[PDB]
RNA sequence: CUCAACACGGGGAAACUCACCAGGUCCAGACACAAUAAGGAUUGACAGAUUGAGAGCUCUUUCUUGAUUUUGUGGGUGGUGGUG
């Protein structure tokens, strides 16, 4: 059992991403509002074709991407993303309840402290 | 190369520059000079710029 | 005959006193009503930078001055008589627009 | 410079016709405002002129300023143009 | 030795060079006859194999009003009668490279060292 | 900065150099003395039939535009 | 780095600033000499691979370009690189 806001995650798949946007935070209702010319669909081209590569085996395979500033969209679930975190990319699978979110929140950009104790 | 200039310039300190020196460190842009700190100090005299009080 | 506005505007007190003082004076060599020079408020551009390059020191501070003084004159001449005047009083630093009507 | 030969042409006709250029330190400016070339491709072009000779060149608060001398009005003449014609300022 | 002995050629070319009319090299010619902006054609005596002789006068003998050519020697010193080659410092020229076709498409140019060519032509 | 460890693979790869093949303009020749148009012209009105289209695999490319003529067949 | 460093570098840095880090382009290496080179010095590119990427980066492919470039030798130029 998953909904977002009220819409079950069955509804979700079978909505295009400008319904999805109508029911979202302020946020995403103004970026996408403005969002003419963002070049969305050179990564989400490479989304699509990689699930086809899987027909019911373990995920897909993984697309590295640098944009950390991209709103995930519930066409974007099942999916796994490499997410640069300013050296590295890292996977990390789109779980449904992801929605609304920055690539950028799953991808830390600093190895935290670890102050002292070498041990 | 279609990606060499191609970041946006249109606000912020990367845009403007010093008219003498090209600098974007400690720009007066007040009355539409757009000349440095240093700069504007050196040839305050010549603008008309004097110091009285 | 036409109405017409003078004004006058410099950062010389001198150099523009003298200038109001020649249009007047052109004035009633030849009689007409003057609406003589009505002085605005003079106008303190201030800059103030801090007073070096890199901040070592103390902390001191300059003021730059730029002194705008302003004055109009709203005079009515025949149309002949205009040019003249306009093109005799010419002086460096002071610049002088004339306003139709 | 790989600078097309057809903008040669505009530049240094242009440089014939008025004997200064003064063409604003800014690379990659797109279109420079007098000569309908790239802004680039004028700085670059009377670089070259100036190491051999044939012009001077003044720089000053982020402007250059590019001055035909004598060895050069020769020069660019059979480059462009035929003989008797006057460049510069000398033309009264 | 009187006047001339085919020595008009040249400023023929010379006039074609300062009007940048002369397409020099092949490639350039052997497309500029096929869409018929061709005035004259001057390739070569002798190449390899022959294989670009029927290749130019081909497009030259073509039935659709123009027949321009006349022939050339060899073409190492076609290459001083192109542009290729300075003056290279008092020398008889630079290190000049090859040749074997040179085609004018406009001469912008004037009479008789140019006109007694087309008579040379247009007359036989 | 002292030193640069280059951790991409060695790459001081350069681009194709133009690539310098043999003579090629060749539309082809019968004997006296015709020709015919191989790898045929544009459509471009400002394309005044003497560019030559190449054929990849199933397509129709030219070169006197920057990018992109695509009369397929 | 005491007064005479520490809301100071006009220093309120999301990009730009930017000098730092992980990566990708470009030459904006003038001129002179020598070589390649009009049987083409060289330049650019559709689609796909590839790439963070609609960077022809580089590769597959085969068109375009034409003498400005390229290569080498000297230099030139730039540097918020060092030394206050």
Redesign the pocket.
């Known amino acids: 059992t998953h909904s977002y806001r009220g819409v079950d995650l069955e509804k979700l798949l079978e909505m295009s991403t400008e319904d999805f946007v109508k029911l979202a935070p302020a946020r995403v209702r103004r970026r996408f509002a403005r969002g003419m010319t963002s070049?969305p669909?050179?990564?989400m081209?490479?989304l699509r074709?990689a699930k086809l590569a899987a027909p019911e085996n373990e995920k897909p395979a993984p697309?590295?991407?640098?944009?950390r500033?991209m709103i995930i969209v519930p066409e974007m679930i099942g999916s796994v993303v490499g997410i640069?975190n300013?050296?590295?990319?890292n996977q990390v699978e789109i779980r449904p309840e992801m929605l609304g979110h920055y690539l950028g929140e799953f991808s830390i950009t600093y190895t935290p402290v670890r102050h002292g104790r070498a041990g | 190369?279609?990606?060499?200039?191609?970041?946006?310039?249109?606000?912020?300190?990367?845009?403007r520059q010093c008219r003498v020196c090209s600098?974007?460190?400690?720009?007066?842009?007040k009355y539409g000079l757009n000349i440095?700190?240093?700069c504007?100090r050196e040839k305050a005299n010549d603008i008309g710029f004097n110091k009285f009080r | 005959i036409i109405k017409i506005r003078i004004t006058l505007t410099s950062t010389k007190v001198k150099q523009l006193e003298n200038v109001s003082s020649n249009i007047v004076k052109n004035a009633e060599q030849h009689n007409l009503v003057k609406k003589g020079p009505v002085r605005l408020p003079t106008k303190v551009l201030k800059?103030?930078?801090?007073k070096?390059?890199?901040?070592?020191?103390?902390?001191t501070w300059e003021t730059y001055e730029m002194r705008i003084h302003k004055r109009y004159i709203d005079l009515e001449a025949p149309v002949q008589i205009v040019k003249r005047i306009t093109q005799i009083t010419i002086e460096p630093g002071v610049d002088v627009e004339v306003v139709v009507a | 410079?790989?600078?097309?030969?057809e903008d040669?042409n505009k530049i240094h006709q242009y440089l014939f016709q008025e004997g200064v250029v003064v063409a604003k330190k800014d690379?990659?400016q797109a279109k420079h405002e007098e000569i309908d070339t790239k802004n680039?491709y004028v700085?670059?072009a009377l670089?070259?002129?100036?190491?051999?000779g044939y012009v001077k060149t003044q720089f000053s608060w982020q402007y250059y300023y590019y001055t035909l001398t004598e060895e050069g009005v020769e020069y660019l003449r059979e480059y462009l143009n035929l003989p008797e014609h006057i460049v510069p300022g000398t033309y009264i | 030795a009187e006047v001339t002995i085919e020595d008009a050629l040249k400023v023929v070319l010379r006039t074609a060079l300062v009007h940048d009319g002369l397409?020099?090299?092949?490639?350039?010619?052997?497309?500029a006859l096929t869409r018929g902006e061709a005035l004259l054609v001057v390739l070569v005596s002798?190449?390899?194999?022959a294989?670009?002789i029927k290749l130019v006068e081909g497009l030259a003998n073509d039935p659709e009003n123009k027949v321009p050519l006349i022939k050339v020697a060899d073409?190492?010193q076609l290459?001083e009668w192109?542009?290729?080659?300075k003056i290279?410092?008092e020398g008889n020229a630079?290190?000049?490279?090859?040749?074997?076709?040179?085609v004018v498409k406009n001469w912008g140019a004037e009479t008789d060292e140019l006109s007694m060519i087309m008579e040379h032509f247009s007359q036989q | 900065?002292k030193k640069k460890?280059?951790?991409?693979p060695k790459?001081i790869?350069?681009?194709?150099?133009?690539?310098?093949?043999?003579?090629?303009?060749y539309y082809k020749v019968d004997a006296e003395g015709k020709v015919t148009k191989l790898?045929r012209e544009c459509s471009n009105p400002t394309c005044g039939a003497?560019?030559?289209?190449?054929?990849?695999?199933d397509?129709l490319?030219?070169?006197?535009?920057?990018?992109?003529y695509?009369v397929n067949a």
């Not at chain 4, 410079?1 to 030969?5: E, G, S, V």
């Open positions: 070049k669909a050179g990564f081209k490479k074709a697309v590295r991407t640098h944009m500033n640069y300013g050296k590295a990319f | 190369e279609n990606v060499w200039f191609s970041h946006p310039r249109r606000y912020g300190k990367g845009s600098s974007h460190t400690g720009l007066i842009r440095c700190r240093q504007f | 800059i103030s930078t801090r070096t390059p890199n901040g070592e020191g103390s902390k | 410079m790989l600078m097309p030969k040669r690379f990659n680039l700085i670059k670089q070259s002129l100036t190491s051999k | 397409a020099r090299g092949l490639r350039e010619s052997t497309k002798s190449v390899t194999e294989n670009i073409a190492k290459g192109a542009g290729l080659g290279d410092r630079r290190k000049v490279v090859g040749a074997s076709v040179v | 900065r460890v280059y951790t991409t790459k790869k350069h681009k194709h150099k133009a690539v310098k093949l043999a003579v090629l303009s790898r003497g560019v030559f289209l190449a054929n990849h695999k397509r490319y030219c070169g006197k535009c920057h990018s992109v695509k």
